[PDB]
Design a protein around this nucleic acid. Structure first.
Ligand code: K
Ligand code: K
Ligand code: K
Ligand code: K
Ligand code: K
Ligand code: K
Ligand code: K
Ligand code: K
Ligand code: K
Ligand code: MG
Ligand code: MG
Ligand code: MG
Ligand code: MG
Ligand code: MG
Ligand code: MG
Ligand code: MG
Ligand code: MG
Ligand code: MG
Ligand code: MG
Ligand code: MG
Ligand code: MG
Ligand code: MG
Ligand code: MG
Ligand code: MG
Ligand code: MG
Ligand code: MG
Ligand code: MG
Ligand code: MG
Ligand code: MG
Ligand code: MG
Ligand code: MG
Ligand code: MG
Ligand code: MG
Ligand code: MG
Ligand code: MG
Ligand code: MG
Ligand code: MG
Ligand code: MG
Ligand code: MG
Ligand code: MG
Lengths: 94, 94, 45, 95, 55, 122
RNA sequence: CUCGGAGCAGAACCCAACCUCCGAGCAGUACAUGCUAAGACUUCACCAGUCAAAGCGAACUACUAUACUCAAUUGAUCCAAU
RNA sequence: CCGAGCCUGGUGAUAGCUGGUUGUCCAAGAUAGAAUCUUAGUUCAACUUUAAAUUUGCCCACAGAACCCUCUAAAUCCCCUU
RNA sequence: GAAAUUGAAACCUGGCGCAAUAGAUAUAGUACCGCAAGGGAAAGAUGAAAAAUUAUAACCAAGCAUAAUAUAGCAAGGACUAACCCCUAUACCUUCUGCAUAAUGAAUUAACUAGAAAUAACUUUGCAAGGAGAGCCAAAGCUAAGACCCCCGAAACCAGACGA
C-alpha cells in the first residue's frame, strides 16, 4: 500500500528499501558505544560501492572512446594536407 | 445445465473469457512503461563509428583471465602433516 | 633440509603407529556405489 | 562377443575384424572402401580411385574394434620390411 | 626422488621456467612422496637444469 | 511462424512532443542507462532469455547500469518489453574515491554521492 | 516399399502425411572416361556418394580442347567364375 | 485340467512382454535424424553427464547470398563492434 | 579353438561360514499327497538340581481387552484457553502425452526377497627407459589397488521313466 505515493516523493516504493528506517542501526550499547554494523547493511554498502564504481568505469570508457575517435578525425584531416604538395607542374601551363 | 463441451480453455468450443476493468488498466500501465522505453532508446550518446573499439582492451583482458583460470587446473598439493595427523586418533592421556 | 629431518622428528611427538590408526592414501579408495536409497535405487540406473 | 571363454575364462577376439581391418599401434584402424571390386565398368575413374584408397576409421568405429579384439593385436610389432611401419606412430600431433 | 625441502625446489623450478613459459608454471608439490608435478613437457630442459646444479 | 521481430527505426525517432513529456534533451543525451527487469523471461522465446542474462538482469527489480551506445541499445530493443529503461542522473557528478562508500541510487534515477540518513535542516 | 525433379518448405541449409504432380532401373559419343595428388563438399550417423588446383604421361599452336553428354539411370559383405 | 497324458531330467528353458527392484543428502539433467522382418526393440548420430586440454563461444555494423515465377511475407544465413 | 614347447608348489584336524523362515529336504525321505513313477513337510527352547513345579518378576508386532459413538469429509496441518468446531489440503506405488482418477498392485503384522564382470579410461602408490617374483608389455611406460553391469513369470521343445 502506498508504493506509488512513495515514488512521487523520491522515496523507495517499498519502505524496507533505502532510508533511515532500514539503514540506521537497530540498537546500540546502553553506555553509548555504537554497535557493530548489521550484516545486511554491510552487504548493501558493498553492493552500492560496486554499482558506484561501475558507473565511473562506464563513464570513463565512453569519455576515453570519444577522445580516441576525435583524435583519429583530427589525424585524418592532417594527412590530406601533406599529400597536396608535389613537384611544380610544367608543360602547356608552365 | 450449462456445460462446455470437452475441456474449457481448449478446443473449437471454449468457455468465453472477458476482459475486466482492471485487466485493461494493467495492460495500459505496461504499455506506458514500454512507450517511455522507446523514448530513451532514441538518443544514443555515441554513434556506431565512435563506439567502435572503445572497450576492446578491457574485453580482451577479461577473456585472458578466463583463459588463465581454465588452464590453472591441477591437483592440489599434498602435505606430510596431513598424513601424519591421522595418528592422533589414538592419542590418549598418560 | 626440511623434508627428511622434519618428517621424522615430527613423528616423535605423535602416538605410536599401530593397526588401529592406519588409513589408505586419499583418492586410492573410490567409494562403492550400491542400488540403495532414493538416488541409486528405484530403476537402479 | 565372448567376454569370458568357457575353457580359459578370457576375452575372445572376433576374427571378422582381423580379416578386414589393420590396427596401427597409434590407435588408428585402416580399412578398404566397400565395393572397390564391384561393378567397375559403371564407375568413373575418379570414383574408382577413391574406392582403392586405404582410409581410416573414426573414433566410434576405432573404439568398437578395440573392444572386439584382444590385447595381442594392440602390441607393437617389428615386422621386417613392413609397408605400414611408418604409420604406426604419430608426428606433430597437438591435443 | 626429491629429498629435503621440496618447496625450495618448486621456487627454483618456477623461477627457471618463468622466462620460457612467460608465466608462472602450474606445479603440484607432493611432500609425502617427494614428487614435483609440472604441467607441460619440460623433461629435456629440467634434465639439463638439474645436471648443471650438480645432481 | 513466430520469429524474431524487426522493429522499424521510425519507432525510435523521438518527436518534439515526446521530449516535453519525458524531459529529455536530444542535444545532450544521457550517458548511461538504468535498466531494471520488471517482467519474467518465462513464456518468452529463448533468445530473449539469453539477452537478459547478457545484460545481467537475472534478478527482477535489481537496477543495472548500461552505457547508452548503439550496440547496448540493440540488445535493449529486443527485450524492451521486459525492462524499464531510465536515464542515470548525476546531480553532484560522478562519485570520487573519497565518496565511493557514501553513494545511493534513489528511485528517481539520481545517484547521490552523499547519504547521511538525516532529515534536511531547510 | 529403391532412386530423381517440382509444390507444400516464397529468401542459407533442413523439414513430414496411405499429401499434390512428373519421371528413373537407360541411351549416345570417346578409347589418356590414363596415373597420381593439395584442399573441400556430403542427403542430418555409418556405409556410400561428390568436386577438385598442382604434378607425371598425353593431346594441342582450328576443335566454349584437360575428371565425356546426361537428373535419377541403381545393390554392401561373404561366396562363386577367372 | 488331452489339438495330445503324467512325472523326472536337460532347466535358473527363453521371453524386444508385464510386474517388482531395499539407507540419508546435494548437484547437473527433457534431447534434429538415419538404418533396421524395423517403428512395443536396438545401433550410430543428436542431446545429456563426468574428467581433461586450450580458445574463442553467444549476442551481432556495414558489405554480401538468382534467375525462372502469382502471393513483390514474417524472417534466416554471413557478421566486426559491443 | 589347439599343438610343439614351457614348467612350479603341495605341513589333515581349518573358517572376516550358517544359527530353527538360516544352514542339508531332514527331528525325515518320516507324516501327508499320487494307481504308479514321483512330490514332499512342519517343529525345539526353565534351572546346578524337578528326588527344587505355588516355578523362571517385569516391559516389546499385528489382533484385542482395560475404554463404542456426536454435524464435516485422504482424517492431517496451521493452530488454539479448548479434543472437535475455523482456515488450508484431490492417498501411495506402478504405468503414461497426461491418473483423486471409476487404470495397476496392496487387509495387516513379523521374517525372508532383487546389480554378479571384462575392454580401455580415470584416481592413488611403487619403479622408471625400463616395469613385472621366466611367459607379457614398452617411442613414459609398466606393475598393484580402488571403482561399472538385478529379481519373478510363460505357452513350449527334447530325453528317459511311470500309468488302461
Ligand atoms: K472444448
Ligand atoms: K533412482
Ligand atoms: K533424479
Ligand atoms: K520390440
Ligand atoms: K503397482
Ligand atoms: K501395466
Ligand atoms: K475416470
Ligand atoms: K484412468
Ligand atoms: K481395470
Ligand atoms: Mg469437461
Ligand atoms: Mg519403491
Ligand atoms: Mg526453397
Ligand atoms: Mg535447421
Ligand atoms: Mg555428413
Ligand atoms: Mg591438371
Ligand atoms: Mg489327466
Ligand atoms: Mg527370465
Ligand atoms: Mg522376443
Ligand atoms: Mg537441479
Ligand atoms: Mg532385412
Ligand atoms: Mg523406435
Ligand atoms: Mg548462430
Ligand atoms: Mg562473431
Ligand atoms: Mg530348516
Ligand atoms: Mg542327520
Ligand atoms: Mg500391541
Ligand atoms: Mg473442513
Ligand atoms: Mg478443504
Ligand atoms: Mg493412455
Ligand atoms: Mg489432477
Ligand atoms: Mg471411489
Ligand atoms: Mg486405483
Ligand atoms: Mg493395465
Ligand atoms: Mg494377502
Ligand atoms: Mg561389477
Ligand atoms: Mg570392475
Ligand atoms: Mg511372482
Ligand atoms: Mg526345435
Ligand atoms: Mg520323447
Ligand atoms: Mg480294464
Amino acid at each position: 500500500a502506498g508504493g506509488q505515493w512513495r515514488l512521487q516523493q523520491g522515496l523507495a516504493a517499498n519502505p524496507s528499501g533505502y532510508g533511515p528506517l532500514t539503514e540506521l542501526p537497530d540498537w546500540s550499547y546502553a553506555d553509548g558505544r555504537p554497535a557493530p554494523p548489521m550484516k545486511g547493511q554491510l552487504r548493501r554498502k558493498a553492493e552500492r560501492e560496486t554499482f558506484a564504481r561501475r558507473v565511473v568505469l562506464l563513464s570513463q570508457e565512453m569519455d576515453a572512446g570519444l577522445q580516441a575517435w576525435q583524435l583519429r578525425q583530427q589525424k585524418l584531416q592532417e594527412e590530406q594536407r601533406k599529400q597536396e604538395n608535389a613537384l611544380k607542374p610544367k608543360g602547356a601551363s608552365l | 445445465r450449462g456445460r462446455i463441451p470437452g475441456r474449457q480453455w481448449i478446443g473449437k468450443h471454449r468457455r468465453p473469457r472477458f476482459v475486466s476493468l482492471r485487466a485493461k488498466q494493467n495492460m495500459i500501465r505496461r504499455l506506458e512503461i514500454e512507450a517511455e522505453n522507446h523514448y530513451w532508446l532514441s538518443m544514443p550518446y555515441m554513434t556506431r563509428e565512435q563506439e567502435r573499439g572503445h572497450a576492446a582492451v578491457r574485453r580482451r583482458e577479461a577473456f585472458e583471465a578466463i583463459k588463465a583460470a581454465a588452464t590453472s587446473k591441477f591437483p592440489p598439493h599434498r602435505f606430510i602433516a596431513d598424513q601424519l595427523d591421522h595418528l592422533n586418533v589414538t592419542k590418549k592421556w598418560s | 633440509q626440511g623434508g627428511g629431518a622434519r618428517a621424522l622428528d615430527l613423528l616423535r611427538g605423535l602416538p605410536r603407529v599401530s593397526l588401529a590408526n592406519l588409513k589408505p592414501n586419499p583418492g586410492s579408495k573410490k567409494p562403492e556405489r550400491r542400488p540403495r536409497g532414493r538416488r541409486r535405487g528405484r530403476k537402479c540406473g | 562377443l565372448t567376454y569370458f571363454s568357457a575353457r580359459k575364462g578370457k576375452r575372445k577376439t572376433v576374427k571378422a575384424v582381423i580379416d578386414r581391418f589393420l590396427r596401427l599401434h597409434c590407435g588408428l584402424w585402416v580399412r578398404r572402401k566397400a565395393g572397390y571390386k564391384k561393378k567397375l565398368w559403371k564407375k568413373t575413374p575418379a570414383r574408382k580411385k577413391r574406392l582403392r584408397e586405404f582410409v581410416f576409421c573414426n573414433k566410434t568405429q576405432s573404439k568398437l574394434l578395440d573392444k572386439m579384439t584382444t590385447s595381442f593385436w594392440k602390441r607393437r610389432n617389428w615386422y621386417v620390411d613392413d609397408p605400414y611401419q611408418k604409420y604406426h606412430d604419430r608426428t606433430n600431433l597437438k591435443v | 626422488k626429491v629429498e629435503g625441502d621440496i618447496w625450495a625446489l618448486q621456487k627454483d623450478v618456477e623461477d627457471f621456467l618463468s622466462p620460457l613459459l612467460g608465466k608462472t608454471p602450474v606445479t603440484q608439490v607432493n611432500e609425502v612422496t617427494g614428487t614435483l608435478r609440472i604441467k607441460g613437457y619440460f623433461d629435456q630442459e629440467l634434465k639439463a637444469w638439474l645436471l648443471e646444479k650438480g645432481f | 511462424k513466430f520469429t524474431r521481430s524487426r522493429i522499424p527505426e521510425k519507432v525510435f525517432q523521438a518527436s518534439p512532443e515526446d521530449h516535453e513529456k519525458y524531459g529529455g534533451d536530444p542535444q545532450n543525451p544521457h550517458k548511461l542507462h538504468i535498466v531494471t527487469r520488471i517482467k519474467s523471461t518465462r513464456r518468452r522465446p529463448y533468445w530473449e532469455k539469453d539477452i537478459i542474462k547478457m545484460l545481467g538482469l537475472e534478478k527482477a527489480h535489481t537496477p543495472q547500469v548500461h552505457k547508452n551506445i548503439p550496440s547496448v541499445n540493440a540488445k535493449l530493443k529486443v527485450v524492451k518489453h521486459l525492462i524499464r529503461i531510465k536515464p542515470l542522473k548525476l546531480p553532484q557528478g560522478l562519485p570520487a574515491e573519497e565518496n565511493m562508500s557514501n553513494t545511493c541510487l534513489k528511485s528517481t534515477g539520481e545517484l547521490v554521492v552523499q547519504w547521511h540518513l538525516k532529515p534536511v535542516e531547510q
